[PDB]
Each structure stands twice: as structure tokens, then as C-alpha cells.
Amino acid sequence: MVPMDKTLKEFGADVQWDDYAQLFTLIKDGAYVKVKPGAQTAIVNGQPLALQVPVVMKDNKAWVSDTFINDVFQSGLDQTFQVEKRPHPLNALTADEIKQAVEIVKASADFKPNTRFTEISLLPPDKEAVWAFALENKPVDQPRKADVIMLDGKHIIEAVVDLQNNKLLSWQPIKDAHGMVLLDDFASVQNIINNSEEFAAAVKKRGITDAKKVITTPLTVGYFDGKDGLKQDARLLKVISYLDVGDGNYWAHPIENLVAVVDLEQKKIVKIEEGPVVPVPMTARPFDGRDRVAPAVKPMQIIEPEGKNYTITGDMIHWRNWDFHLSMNSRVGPMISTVTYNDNGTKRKVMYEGSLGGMIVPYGDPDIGWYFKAYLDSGDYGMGTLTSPIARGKDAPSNAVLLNETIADYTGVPMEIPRAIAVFERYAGPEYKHQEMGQPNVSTERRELVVRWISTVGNYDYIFDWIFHENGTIGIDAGATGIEAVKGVKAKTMHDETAKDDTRYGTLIDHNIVGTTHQHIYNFRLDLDVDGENNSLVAMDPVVKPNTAGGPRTSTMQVNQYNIGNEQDAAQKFDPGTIRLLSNPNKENRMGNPVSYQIIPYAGGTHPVAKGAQFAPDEWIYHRLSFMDKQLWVTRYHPGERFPEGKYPNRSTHDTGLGQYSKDNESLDNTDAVVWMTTGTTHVARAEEWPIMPTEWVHTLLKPWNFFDETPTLGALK
Amino acid sequence: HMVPMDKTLKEFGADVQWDDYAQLFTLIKDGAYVKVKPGAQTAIVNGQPLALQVPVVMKDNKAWVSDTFINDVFQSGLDQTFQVEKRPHPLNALTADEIKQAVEIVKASADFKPNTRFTEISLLPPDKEAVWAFALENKPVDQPRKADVIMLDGKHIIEAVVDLQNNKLLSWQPIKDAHGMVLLDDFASVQNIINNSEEFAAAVKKRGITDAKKVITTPLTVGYFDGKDGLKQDARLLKVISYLDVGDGNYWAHPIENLVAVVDLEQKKIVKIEEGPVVPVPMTARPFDGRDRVAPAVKPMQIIEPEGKNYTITGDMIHWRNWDFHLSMNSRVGPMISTVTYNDNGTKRKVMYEGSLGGMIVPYGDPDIGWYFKAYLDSGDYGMGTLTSPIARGKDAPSNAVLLNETIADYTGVPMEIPRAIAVFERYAGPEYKHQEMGQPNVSTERRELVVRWISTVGNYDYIFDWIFHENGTIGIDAGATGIEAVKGVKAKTMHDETAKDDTRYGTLIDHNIVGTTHQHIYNFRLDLDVDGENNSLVAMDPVVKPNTAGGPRTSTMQVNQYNIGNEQDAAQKFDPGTIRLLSNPNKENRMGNPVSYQIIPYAGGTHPVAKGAQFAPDEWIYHRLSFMDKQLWVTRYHPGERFPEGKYPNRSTHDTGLGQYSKDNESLDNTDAVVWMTTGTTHVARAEEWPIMPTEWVHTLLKPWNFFDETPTLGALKK
């Protein structure tokens, strides 16, 4: 025997007791259990279960067999998860493969002692073969390989290892490339600042008494052709600083106009920039509730007492008509692959690979602490690695299933992220309705399946929802919350003398605190294969035309349809009142229309919307990051073009991302296209967002357009 | 004496669940979550024990309950969701008694006549100031209940006012040139006239229809074309589009293309018939109710609140966390949200006096005979309140909703109770906010939204409206569009056929011989916001990239052009989602000295392509008559009688009597009671996926508090 509540709760399950029915309801992920004290059986997801040892109440607390959790939860009656006997080829590197891959490169003579690992990822087999596995179950007969990107001090080396034959295939130093920021870079930064008298001296003049309460925060310095006075070949980071005052929120305590430049290889400050002295804002601004009492609230549960409609086999997810593969990358996070829609018995391709391509959070302030500030979260910091374990019931609904995911840390040791991804089905209003006058109503409810992932980088937290509608539509939403980066200012209200200058670049959200204006710009890489590899990009611009057909009408609503033939033309602004299809010239629906998916890069947002990059076309950030200033891109599929901002965007001098990918202006006619959607907000701060910002959402959509022959949700014929 | 539980509870409208293992019934109905065991002497209502004289009885696997079980339980009082109102809110709708009274009073007048019908019988609104004072200070409105009675005498409109407190007629005003909306007996009348028409049956025969009794008609308003349509301006007319009933329950899927009959409702006779080319009626059966479909298995998913709701409904007053508002029902525009305040640490702060659907238009873009005049002003011309569609419990709204009934007057002046007319439901909407500081304990709270949902159906469209209250002070308004499409009969089976290009010039070919004629849905919401008070100003904030004049390597910066919008004419404008438009109160500021404001977002997105305006050339009449179609934002000085964007009597109107009229005098909007109007819509290009039945498509609008508060609104009560 072992006590129930204690055991169940260490296991992560939710325990409810109902005195009226003398019934225990146990819930974890897909398993929904009902068990009575002294009963010889139980119920798991609607199904009966014989028990070796019944539950016994001693002194009013239940006691269970030391074998209970296994017997009941791993009983096999929770069918949410199934064994994958034949591993999908896109499956992420396992802990073993991660360790194997590190052994191989550590065994080369070229591997230098304190080398770190920026990324250790599956080297993807060729697309054709993966599709073949998913559609025909044809074994992919190449060995598992891994890209091993190393950082030797400040030097980038790309290696490829063969895991089947346990041997090194190649070792390539990458010239002029800078490495992303690694975890230990954060400690140096702080450690190096701590040991500098010059810095302790600057801090003191700034009105700070205890230098050991100063918090560093490291930032990439971008590239300014030398105008920032920084060397190109040295590995650099700028340091912004705050003051810990004990409120658990150093962000609310900026030390404005103090910037330190740190050379991570000389391990010392190579430059201090000082500006007007500003009193650090002192007022405690906690956000974690320490100073609050939440109002009582009636409970709300979302229950699926017979288990889930989806089934997770290894990393393969089957839900209704959808099948797809969900894996984890240390840089961009989740990757949705081999997505198909089962049209009445036939699996048709929709998407080969979909994922966050890359993002950036650039600021609009000229001053010394801000002008270089632009966050390439995934690219520079690694958003997968910094995944934030989903908080059960809060970050995701009470009926979610939470998945664990494994990647490699910067020292090459496997790393299991708990509750890394949330999978939950949700009611989304009525799928469709007609109430014909004097007739029985017709209503069916809409279900969506959501794959939710949260990554936290410094002060923001970002949420991403990959949303699968029953009817074939796929949504992609990005949410933003967390703590704003604020500029310390003298003014305490808008009546103060400095208020005007103080707010030229942001709103005054708290006394002495201004939320500098910025943008959030997300870019999603979507290798759609619309009912096949070979597609074309078609515009339909609804327009008003003169009526030629007679009658009283002077005008009509018609459409301008034309193919978009190349990559340069495909890289365009998006007008939400126009229609953009990726069509399959080769296949047609019942009515003779090319099967297509409608692409909607802006389907709404709760913050103001970016129409492009709020940067003059001669700014360096603008020249380097093209993807910011166009909402739609379409390129020819090539296996190594995956990042809108480039593979090595840290202090890049030119554009190696979508700018480079479309530079060559290849043709997009009946060929394999990759869609890139850029959507962003322009954030003008306000008091309601301080000291912690309510989640703001942006929406994007991919709709079937004559992909089907009718309403996809009516069902099969009798 | 006893009765079958299961059947009785179904009539009564409650969900029933039997758990054989626990031998336990779980019963659900609105705010009532009940648990009862067979033979047990007590039951559980919202977590509270209730005693039963007569327990539930199991008899050969059939449950049985006494004939008072349903009252004893669901009206016990342990369900605290609904409370009774001590002092009646002055904004409460006309009761059934008040309706019947207002009708007696006018029938007592010299000039009343037996054919006279009632287009709208609605409370004459008390003055804003008295009403507010009631909500905020609790001061009795000492002004007497009156009711606006709009009658239709044959084809003439008359506006009568009745004093209900004193049971007297106050006024009786004939309105020249005004045409009345379409009424219910109009539908019946039109079908009859066609069925008695010798010519029409002949026209129908030519077009391959072998049985005319099978011809389903449908009435549309005709609009105005300065006589170009050949229609005398002053007669009460309706054009008639026709379909063939094939027994598939979907007559919409079988158009009789190019046959249009004009009907004079006074003459009760077909005054004109327009005929075009003969096009074979699409015959294939295309039901949407699933009769020909397989019902797959779906595992159950309940959203439950077993201790009751967080909101309370007292009369028509709804209280939920910091929100307080009054909810009622107009026969024309449906639900009305009034005296909306937000409670800030003890003090109720004004947010909105009155919000509701202003009006909507669904105009088509095809110039042919059966399409060129076609634009529906659904609320204005057909009365959307009256055509409210009862909520399909569990489907049209989630399993944890409470469904309100609402009472209006019908067209003969008889009270009419609409069951499940409005849905109220709280919903989880992700994390309110979150920060997971590296190395630290996470911080996350869940977001809750209270939704007020209403569905009205007009012919083939079904529209859904959500009024959404975020705990953090934000208000959302989404409009959903579903139902069946008005399709055009054409000759082409596929795009390969010879006439495919011609047949699809004005719409997509979504099925053999069927085209989804392009059109738009344009919604407009009239929002009498009072941001922390009546006197407001409209402010603009345009994020711009200005050259950097402060040194450093930056060539440019992100700054903001702020300016007031001083008058109505300037306030009537397009909305660019990259800009910020506030309704600020210039008399009140937050802790930081910023004017407390609400940010107004008429376009927060949608699932159909968005309409940038009216897709009409600027010389079309419908464009002329309806200026509200072409700007997304309007603000006007509050005036009690200015409620409709399309104008109060839009049927065959000849000039804008709505938002064009309201703002034409270009009044000042500086520090004055403002009314905000938001227009938003979709351009609907059809696709096979939307046939035979259209998946619900949504558009979102948003109202965010902007420096209205001093801090994150949902942090919680301060401990010091």
C-alpha cells in the first residue's frame, strides 16, 4: 500500500473526490479514471478494469497498491498513445543519437577542448523518400545523419556525422560566421561586469550603492559598417543593466544610458558607453502576485471522459481527417511535417514541412542603449532550447495533453523539456448553421486541434498555435506576453518638463518608465505541397468593373486572375482584400478548378499592424533583414534554405535569408514552392501592459480553395 | 404519481448522463449542474445538498421521478445564476403586458384600421442622463414609460407614441414617402399571388418546370434606380426570385434563373414580369441536413461549471467580475448592451452607454436581371430581432452556456416569446499573461471572456454576433456568417464547358450548373461609448518613421503623429490597422497624466477577404443611398434619434438618411458626447468548400482600454 493523493500527485495527475457519489475521478492527459473505494473494478476512458487490489480508505484518506498507477494508467485502456514499430524518418535525434553524434566529433583530432554546440539536429533525408514513407510506407534506406554545428571559442564549424555507421562524414570551418548566443555567455557577461572597476565606477556615479545587485542582460550588437566602432572579427555582445531591488522584476529598474561592450574571448569589457545620468526607477513592481490576492472563482473543467479523438503514435498524430508528424528543433521549436488530409479514403498532401522560420523584435529608439537593439529570438538565442514548460490548465486548457521533447544543450548533453508542447482539441463555435424558417434547425459544432508551444527569451514570452480545423483549414497564431523592455526617464507624468522628449520614442507607462516603441515580426516557413509537389502561385484581385451587360447597374464585381511567375514577383506586400493561391496546375476538383490553398498572412491582430519594417530603407537592420518588409514570399524548394533571416544572422553584413533565396529570381511555374508568411505588430506601449503584458495575438490562415468538391465536414455518403 | 425521467428532462431541455459504474445521474441545464443517485434521499445542486421527498426510482432499467421533480430541483434556489430584480431597470424592454397595452391605446384612436400592422413596438428610451444616474447613483427615473409604435397602414407609415404610465396616446404622426419594412404576411402574400398567377405558371412552364405547386418563391426589396428599373417610386413593391423544390430540403440549390416577378402588395397582384434566357434548373439533390450522410462517432467533450456560474443575471442586469451591463432585445437590431461600467477598485467607471448592431448590408455584384437590384439591409428591411434563431444548445453555443429567452412584439402586435434567443457563456481563452523568468518559478494566469451571443437568420444567411467582455477591460465584437448561398443557375457543368468563362465572370463555379455570385457582407455597429464620462474627444496616433536627428548610427526612428479629429466630417474615414484611433476623455487622466481612453479597432481581422469599401462604382445609387459602406470609422455627436447607419426607413429610400445624414452638418467632436460607428465586412468570392452549406466565417472588432487604467488590469486586489 501507498497513499493515493501523495502518489497520484507526484505522478502529475489531478485527483477529485466526490463525497456524494463516493467516487474518485482521476485525470492525467488522455486518461480519465473513475474509481470507487472498495470496488473490485474501475473505469478508464469509459472502459471497465479489474483491480488486483481495490482502493481502501483508512482514516479518511485513500490508499492504493504500490502497483496502481502502472496497473491503471499504463493499462492500455488509455489509447491516446500507441507504439511506433517503424520510426518516422523525420523523428528528432534521440538522447542516444545525441550522445553518439558528440562522441564521433569529439574523436576527431580537429575537435578543440572547450568546444560548444550551437545545434545538433537530424540531417533530414530527402523529401521524396519521406513522402514515400508517409504515403506508401516505403522504407527510407539512407542512414540517420546529424548536422553538428560547433562553436570553437568564436569559430563556427559544421560537421555531419553518420549515426548508422558511426562515422564522421565532414568537418567544415565556416568563414566569417558568428555563433548564436549560448547559455554560458550569459554568466560570463554577468561575471565579467562584476569584476570590472571601470564598470563598478560608472554604476556608482549613476546612484547605485551596491554594485552586486546589478543585473546584466546580453544583446547581439548587429552590424553598422563600423559606425558603432566595433570590430567585425571579434565575438561581441552589448550589456544592458538593471537593478535588483527585491521585487522579482529587475526589468522595471533600468540603469539608462549605460552600455557595456564585452569581448567574450578576451573575457573583458572592450568599451563602455555613457550618457546622461538618470535616476534608476526604484518602486517595487512585482508581477508574480506576491503583493496581490486573486478573487475566488467557480471551477471550470473541460472533460473528455472517454479519452481523446486524436492518437499520438511516436511523434505521429492522427486526428479526424488529419495526419501529421510533430518534432522539435533547438532553434525554431516545433516542426509539422508530412501533413495530409484524408479525403474520403485517400490521403492528399497539404504540407511537407511547416515551422517558425524566424523572428525579430527591432526597436525604434536612437539613443545609446537602444539603437542597436533588435532581437533575433530563434536565430540568436534558440527558442526551442528556451522552451517554457507549459503550465497545466493555465497555459493550455484543462483538457490538453502535454508532450515532453528532447534536444541537445550547448555542451552536447541531451535535455528533456517537460510539457514542451500542448496538444488539445477545442470547441470553436458552430462549424456551420442554417435555420430555414419553419424547419428543423441544422447545426454542427466546430472542432479545432491545437498544437501549442511557448518559448521565453529574456523578457518576452511567445506562444504559437498550429491550428487544424476539421474542414481542412489550418491556422497559425502567435501570441506575445511577458515583460516590456523599458527606458528609464526623469519624467513621472506627462506634465513634467521632460515628458515630451521622454516620450518621443515610446509611451510613458509608469513613473520614470517608458515602453520604447518596437515591432514584433514573425515569419513562418511553409513548404506546402498542394495535393502534390508541383504548384503555381495565382493572384485573384477582386475589382470593380464597368457593367457591359446592360440594365441599370453601372458597375460589377469581377476578379483579376493571373499567375505570379517568379520569386521576385512572389515577394510582395499582402492586401487582405485580395486572394493568393498556391494552386496545383495538374489536378482539379469536380468543377474543373485547380485544387488550391488560400494563403492569408494577415488574418487579424489585437495590436496595431506592421505594413512593413518601420525602418528607412538605408538602415542596416533593414538591409540585412529583407523578410521584415513583405508579408508573402515564395521560393523554389531547396533543402538548406530554412531561415528568413539567414543561417548565421549574428552581425551579418548582408542578407543570407529570404533576400538571398529570392535574389536569383527563379521560376515558380508548376514547380515545388515554399511559402513564407511574414506578419507583425507595431507595439505602442500603454499602462495596461505594465508591469506585465496581457497576451496579444496575431492570426494567419491557410484555407482550402476548391481543393475539395463540397463542404468537407458533411461526412461520408451512405 | 410519477413520470419517466429521461423523456421529461428532454422536453424540459436538460442534458442527461447516466454513469452505470457510479450509479449516478448528472443533469445539466444552464446554470444548474445536478447530481442525483437512484433511491437517494438528497440530490446535489451546484455543490449543495437538496432534500427530496420522493427519490429517483429505478424500475427495470428505466428511471422515474415525481411530477414535481423538475421544479423542486431546477427552481430550488441553489442555482444562484438568476436573481429577481427589486427595482426595475428603466431600460427593460416592453413586457408582454406593456406591448398589449400600447396596442390597445392606438386601437382606441379614431384613425386606426383593421389591416394596420406593427413594424416596431419598442420602448421609447428615457434620457441618457436619468438612466446613467439610475445605474450609478440609483436615482429613480421619474419620467414615464413610453412606447414607440410604428404602424403600417396598408403601405403608409405612422409613428405613434403611447404613454404607458398614464395609458394615453401622446402622438400620431404620418410619415410621407417612407416605405415600411417587409413583414411576415408579406412572404405568405407573395407566394399566394404567384400561385394564383396564370402568366407566372406559364413563364415557369417554358423554363422546364412541370409542376408549379413546387415553385418556392422568395421576396426581396427592390431598392432605387431613379426609374431605370421601370418601377414607380411610391408603390409598395417586392421582387420575387424563384426556386424548385426537389425534396432535398434545399430549394436554394435549384434556382430558376432569369425569372423575376414584381409584386405590388397593395394591389396584391403581379405588376411586372422580367424574363431572360432559359437556363435549365439544376436538379441534382443537395441536402445539407445530413439525410444522405454517415454520422461518424465522436467522443464526448463537456465544458462544465459544477458549482454554478461566475456571472449573475438579475432581471436583464448581468454582473461578472468587474463588468456590469444591461442586456435586452430590439425587434429590429436584436441585442442591446447598455449602462456598461467597469468596476475599478470600488468605483464604477463608465465605458459604454449603449452598444448594438447598427445595421448591415449584403450587396451583390452581378448585373443580370435576378441580381442587379439585390442588396439586403437585413436588420432594416427584414427585422433581425424578430427573425432571431433559437440557439441549438451545445452546438450553436458551448455546453456551458446559459440561454436567455426574450420577448418582443410581433407584427400584429401580439407578444412573442423567443426561446433560447441569446446565449451567455464564459470561456477559457488562453493565458491572460505569462512570464517565465529563466531559473525562476513560472507566472501564468488564465484568461476568461464572457460572451453574449445572438443568431438571426434571414432567408438563406445565418448571422452570429458575439459581444465579448475580456476580464482585462477589453471589449470584442465578432460577426459570424454561415448558411446557404444565393446561387446563380448557369449552363456550365465545369470550367471546361464553353460558357464557363461567361458564367463565372461574377462568381465562382462551386457546383455543376451552380455559381456562387460574388457579394459582400458589411456590418456596422453603433457604439455610444462614454469613456469614463459623456464628454470625449477623438484622438489619432499614426506610427511613422521619422529621420533620426539625435546622432548615433541610426538613419531613422519610430515616432508618432498625434492629433485630434475635431469634427464629424473628418471623423468619417477609412481605417488603417497600422494606426491608432482613441476616444479619449480630455477631462480625466491616469496615474501617469495620460488621458483615459479606449482604442477603437474596426478591423481586427477576419477569415474571408476583407472589404476595403463598397465594391460599387461611385455613381451607383446604392452607393449614393448608403454612405456607411465606404468608411470603417464614424463618430457623431450623440442624438437620441440617430440609430441606423442605413437610415430609419431604407426601403426604397432615395437618399442617405443614415450616417451620411447624421454627419452632413459636420458638428464639432471636441469634448462632447460622442457616438462611435464601426463598419467592417468581407468580400465573398465563393468556393466549392462552401457548398451545399457554408462553414462559419468570422470578422473581429476590438475596443481596448488605453491608459484607461494605471497598470495591468488583472493583477488583482492590492495587499497593502
Ligand SMILES: [Ca+2]
Ligand atoms: Ca512545396
Ligand SMILES: [Ca+2]
Ligand atoms: Ca458617448
Ligand SMILES: [Cu+2]
Ligand atoms: Cu511588444
Ligand SMILES: [Cu+2]
Ligand atoms: Cu457571403
Ligand SMILES: [Sr+2]
Ligand atoms: Sr531561389
Ligand SMILES: [Sr+2]
Ligand atoms: Sr451630426
